[model samples]
Target chain A: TTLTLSEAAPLLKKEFREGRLIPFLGAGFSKPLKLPDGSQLIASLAKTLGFEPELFDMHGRFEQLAEFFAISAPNRLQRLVYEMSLSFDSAEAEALREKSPMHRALAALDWRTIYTTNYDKHVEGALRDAGKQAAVLASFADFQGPRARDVCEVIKFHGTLDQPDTIVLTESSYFQRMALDAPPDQRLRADLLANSFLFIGYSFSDTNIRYIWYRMNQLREQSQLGVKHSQARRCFFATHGAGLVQPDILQQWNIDVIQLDPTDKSASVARLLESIA
Target chain B: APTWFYNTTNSEKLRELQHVLGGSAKLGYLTAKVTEILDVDLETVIRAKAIAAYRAVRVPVIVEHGALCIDALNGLPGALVKPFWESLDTRLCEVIPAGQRTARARGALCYCDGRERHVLIEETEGEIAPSARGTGGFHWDPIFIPKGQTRTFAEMSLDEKLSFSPLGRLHTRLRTELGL
Candidate 1:
């Protein structure tokens, strides 16, 4: 039977009580945390605003946006930039000190490790606000040694805003890192291989991360191996509310889809944390 | 300077060398003559050696002669027929009715005249007769059936058997090692 958010919540809570480590997070979590409307955000900063940019823009004509940004009105651009930066900064760890439902749910659970591609510090801030001291994995050097027993680790793959170089901004950087000879970035590849990936706050449409799911499928095909090496891996959150994009994509990827209600709020995440054991 | 071929005196090494060069020029000659008669290459004799070697190594290897039968178990027990026949002689007798007991000998003999290799004389066919027979030969002499006849190797006159065969053919293909 399909899993529901309320049912999954207790399971997440149990995992927390039993102390299972969850290692990944996506943009879905942050989108819920205070953001300008999608139309507003796009109008404020998107280049070639009259039309949607194609995914191929990165390969054939990447500087198009940079050029548009240059030609846009200086005062309007400045205001937009300031607003966006303020939004990003405000979404920082310090600003998210209050307990959000997601944060509260996470805090209530026993998560010792978190690997996220988000730049926002809501997760860290929420954890800190809950009086939990967690380790941040932002660079190769951060996750080098044995996992620390005392503190939980939050691995940020797409770089924190404070460290701009770590952000995986361009398509080229994404491909370039795939060829890195170094043992795979454990925070990303190894965790995906070992545990169930809960791809929250992530939308599959027109995103490069969608390619990651494709590549994982390709890897499985070439090796004649099962998904996540036959470990019956799950990759989407058991959200509250009716089934939608997140659950649909996860199902397509052969993941266990959990229903989540958008309105249920705190109870949803809290229940997930409760089910985590 | 010409490379001198050193013979390994050990029985296993001698067997290995023979196994590696299992098919004879005589068999090749017979295949070529038969091919000429039928207007076909009939390179089956040429491929049998490599096929046999591949089976021994348990690795996938390619052979030049495209005599592979797609049907009939996809050429199962094709390359390893010799070894399989050796192992299953007892089973064969059990399967064959006692009244139709026949001794069969299948052999491929190659002749090399110190320099150029040719199929001077060889046999790709089999001979069968009743009972385990034959005093001479390396293996599979006890029970075998020649083409178009059923008689044990011991029952057939050596001269009668030699008359039906042709000279062997040249060694044209090499065996490859399967990476696995």
Candidate 2:
């Protein structure tokens, strides 16, 4: 059964006390800002790919279409991606940096690590605005640097706008990143194995499913090999919408879905964060 | 043991409450009620009252206040529900339309321990009855019907009414948080 906020509260509190909770953010977490969703981004790219508006449907696979566009004109694809990312200019960054209830609540907590799949700088900006020393990690090289113990580390798993080449946007890039065993990826895997995760602004999209599946496989492998792995911590996924059914895939991954009313999702997120804080 | 100083002279109510609190609560009556500032938010009024009560008693105490807000009146008679109910009484049923009656019962429980204070608020949605019914509950219970129920709070058993009461919910939350 899906967990209610009250049901998930004690678990979150336990993880928080043990300093084992990590926040995993997604695009939906940035809903307060007018950032484009994956479909919108894909649609914008389709218009630039010499396709007529009528010929392109947003429901089509975004990565496949982006790959097709890239294969046709690699330079155009690179420039378009770069410009699209930079669209969130300094002004936009400032807007996202402003204090929101969600930002303030999350910032008040002692989060050692935060992970986001979004390419935007909202999380980092908010953390910094909250008077936290935020260290941004976009690539494996960032992990190689001397880490400060006092700062909260933000891992932008899918590269940030500052470095477009490292972004796992296209299907080939995602496949390559999966196979590379990069330090960031290795660190994320280790963190998943060790810490409890609280996922916000995430839908059970294909990309997220792939990550969950990969982590689930690792846990299963450990269990089968009779390795004395650390006690597994249950992860919480906060979702907004009526039609979100808790799938068996989430159960296998040991993730608890905290369903929030769509009309009051932000309030729900703030309330949950406050409870844990 | 923590004691609660109420600003009412209802000895019978105190005895019942003392029993409900598992005999851990010592109830005392004070003639002076705390001055409540006019505010739309119930928490504000409760906090002010709690501080005043703490100042007078110099002991840890739980202060509570409740209000009834009608949607048709744009949440009028909010924090002033006690005086508003006295002035309006049964006329509250005539003011609202037949099927358009909507209102909310908001309750606040503020625990003040001289130096620090913690407040919790609970609300329950309901509508006004066409006419007053039983005489069991206080305030608008005789004329108010809670959501998902046909009977007014006045008509239900004490346990049944307390199950949906905002004050009761606040008590439940406080008891859990305070380990009382």
Candidate 3:
């Protein structure tokens, strides 16, 4: 059920050639940048609410914790999330972007459409360094105006840093997406059906596995063109240092579990990116 | 001996635990002078208090208490309940419209034998009272009425509500965990 880098690269290469390859990134994709995770961001946010971080450290309940912060003080949560992103200055972005092999590979790749849950603009920033303009779908307004198809369209799966209200950082926001009717949710569904995905964020584990599993289940049809899920559309779960995801379930859903070496995450990830390109 | 590591000043947890442990057992109330214990989760704050209480009391068995109110009328969730209750007090019901005079009370209890920790939490769905009533109760008891009941908890018997409540289960769980 798991594919080696040699086996996975060609399949991904085929998708790229067909112009149906969509890179669905997670938090780990920006690991080299050293930015705070969803947990750290909300932890600091709670401190602003007079909450002692140690007393409120509900591990992995960042969403619920964030919801509490939001309910306690409505607009303040959104403002703080937005402000935290602003703290990463342009100079900082440039330095981090170059050193990160994940960004380096992404920048070199000929990706027209990218999907990411990370609040940071590193993916867009990487594209920018490649002399490519990334059109972030942050809000309804982004849908209007001179939408240049020549540029890469970056799908803000969770939300963009500038648009904090649209950011799905809390329990309520996650449930809202679960309904799959929101504009961004609708866009993700449409993209999933039309294009094959390369899930790179799940490096060693099912670290950010919710988005794909839910979307896959939603699209499952009882009758599948007389072919199994494996025959549906090609997809790859590239993990360098991520979790060992249940391969059989994903195999039934026709998603490939591409296992890369756990040691030297940057090197393993780079090989896959380079081979595919 | 039985000890309480939560709010030693005013807490039904102490009284309930005292009853559960029986009248024969001597009571030693314990509370640490925690400099502004933080956070919003009932369990977090309760467990913190419980842990602190254990260090202070150094007892074989201790129980800690925590409470949160979810008032839809004010969008005040579990963590914000403490602050909101202080600001409004008895006038809390006047803020909620008649049709939507509903709220929730989440109660948490942490049981520790100076070895293992057990958390018992219960969410009681109820209606906010028209006004603070009854002769005796603490905090939001005067303003909270159990679902389908007309009287506030202050007007009702503590045993009547908590006999089979978290405190009740906490006792059974505590005993079971200790193999007593």
Which structure among the candidates has the greatest lDDT? 2
Q: Global lDDT of each model?
A: 0.46, 0.71, 0.68
Among these predictions, the greatest TM-score belongs to 3
Task: Quote the lDDT for A148 in model 1.
Answer: 60
- Considering summed lDDT, which 10 consecutive residues are worst modelled in model 1 chain B? B28-37
lDDT of 3 by residue, A181-226 (tens): 7666678666766688888876334433655564665575433446
Interface RMSD of 3: 10.0
Candidate order by TM-score, decreasing, is: 3, 2, 1
Per-residue CA lDDT of model 2 for A188-215, tens digit only, reads 7677667888888865555644575556
Model 3 misplaced regions, further than 4 Å: A87-90, A203-208, A220-230, A241-245, B1-180
Q: Order of all candidates by lDDT, from best down to worst?
A: 2, 3, 1
Candidate 2: which stretches are off by over 4 Å?
Answer: A38-42, A45-48, A220-224, A228-231, A242-248, B1-180
* DockQ (0 to 1) for model 3: 0.02
Computed on C-alphas against the true complex, the DockQ of each candidate is 0.00, 0.01, 0.02
Question: Which window of ten consecutive residues has the lowest lDDT sum in model 2 chain A?
Answer: A240-249
Candidate 1's TM-score: 0.45
Model 1 clash number: 73
Candidate 1 whole-model C-alpha lDDT, 0 to 1: 0.46
Docking level of model 3: incorrect
What is the RMSD of candidate 2?
A: 15.7
